[PDB]
């Protein structure tokens, strides 16, 4: 089998990008937030907190014909910005763009952050990290990648994400009309439970490439892209007026600038992130400042290649016995 559906930028900044998907029966469809850096498949729902439900759509499991309870299971989540959400658990069949998982969890949310409340656009979360971090408690539950994989045509999932514009999420199939060139593909390592990987180095707009190991993880739940203080305070330093700001939370650049590229080595193979890839925008409505879409990762703990740079690249993710990371130019 396969699956292919599109994601769409959640607004003018990409901020983040939602993937519809079929929940029950008849299905439900909620817009979900495709994140290869968790692990649960989490829904607002009829038992979401009122207060805390503002515009997104719901899962109603007592209007579902093939939704059980996990009797006893619970989760409860907090993501790296410091976000959170927790709840209750179904089984329930889940469809992505036409591939269909009979049985699998749906986390259902009695409590949300602000963070997710304040996002109408986001109805929850579809994790494709590795199942070692799902968070259902007695009994770990596995990922809609992870339940479908035997069924597909090929063990593989893609992110092709579009700059300003729709792109797509592909299951069991690799579309070779979606990239230029040839995929160059790099080693993971599952220990932490991601898709973690080591970029072989970078460059800053039409500067020598800097060949050095830059262990980070592929994320399409993370915007940024989160690098070493060293390597991102080299690219700012190309930006007349760019500095960090503490009070902002990171590099902020004047909007009259015209930003430089970034290129990040997959191997010998070489990605490149378009300046305007870079920009954020006004750190506020009106001002001239504008936020960093390259930011240090040195309070994080490891290294993010989040939309900025995924969004730059056709990306396989190789769930094969020994799973690895596929980039493409496009
Ligand atoms: C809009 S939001 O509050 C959000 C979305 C995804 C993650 C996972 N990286 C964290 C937070």
């Known amino acids: 089998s396969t699956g292919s559906a599109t994601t769409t930028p959640i607004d003018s900044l990409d901020d983040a990008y939602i993937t519809p998907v079929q929940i029950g029966t008849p299905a439900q469809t909620l817009?979900?937030?495709?994140?290869?850096?968790?692990?649960?498949?989490?829904?607002?729902?009829?038992?979401?907190?009122?207060?805390?439900?503002?515009?997104?759509?719901?899962?109603?499991?007592?209007?579902?014909?093939?939704?059980?309870?996990?009797?006893?299971?619970?989760?409860?989540?907090?993501?790296?910005?410091?976000?959170?959400?927790?709840?209750?658990?179904?089984?329930?069949?889940?469809?992505?763009?036409?591939?269909?998982?009979?049985?699998?969890?749906?986390?259902?949310?009695?409590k949300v952050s602000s963070s997710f409340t304040?996002?109408?656009?986001?109805?929850?979360?579809?994790?494709?990290?590795?199942?070692?971090?799902?968070?259902?408690?007695?009994?770990?539950?596995?990922?809609?990648?992870?339940?479908?994989?035997?069924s597909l045509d090929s063990p593989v999932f893609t992110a092709d994400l579009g700059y300003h514009a729709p792109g797509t999420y592909n299951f069991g199939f690799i579309d070779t009309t979606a990239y230029t060139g040839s995929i160059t593909y790099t080693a993971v390592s599952t220990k932490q439970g991601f898709w973690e990987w080591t970029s072989t180095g970078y460059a800053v707009g039409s500067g020598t490439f800097k060949?050095?190991?830059?262990?980070?993880?592929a994320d399409t739940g993370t915007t940024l892209l989160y690098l070493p203080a060293t390597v991102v305070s080299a690219y700012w330093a190309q930006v007349s007026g760019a500095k960090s700001s503490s009070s902002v939370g990171g590099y902020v650049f004047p909007c009259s600038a015209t930003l430089p590229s970034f290129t990040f080595g997959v191997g010998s193979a070489r990605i490149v992130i378009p300046g305007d890839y870079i920009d954020f925008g006004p750190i506020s409505t009106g001002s001239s400042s504008c936020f960093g879409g390259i930011q240090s990762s040195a309070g994080i703990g490891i290294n993010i290649f989040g939309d900025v740079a995924l969004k730059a690249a056709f990306v396989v993710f190789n769930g094969a016995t020994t799973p690895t990371l596929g980039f493409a130019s496009k």
């Open 31 to 110: 817009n979900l937030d495709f994140d290869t850096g968790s692990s649960d498949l989490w829904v607002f729902s009829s038992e979401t907190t009122a207060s805390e439900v503002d515009g997104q759509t719901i899962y109603t499991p007592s209007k579902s014909t093939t939704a059980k309870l996990l009797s006893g299971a619970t989760w409860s989540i907090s993501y790296g910005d410091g976000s959170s959400s927790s709840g209750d658990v179904y089984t329930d069949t889940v469809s992505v763009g036409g591939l269909t998982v009979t049985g699998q969890a749906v986390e259902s949310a009695k």
């Open 118 to 150: 304040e996002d109408s656009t986001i109805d929850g979360l579809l994790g494709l990290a590795f199942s070692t971090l799902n968070t259902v408690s007695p009994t770990q539950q596995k990922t809609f990648f992870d339940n479908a994989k035997a």
């Open 211 to 217: 060949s050095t190991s830059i262990d980070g993880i």
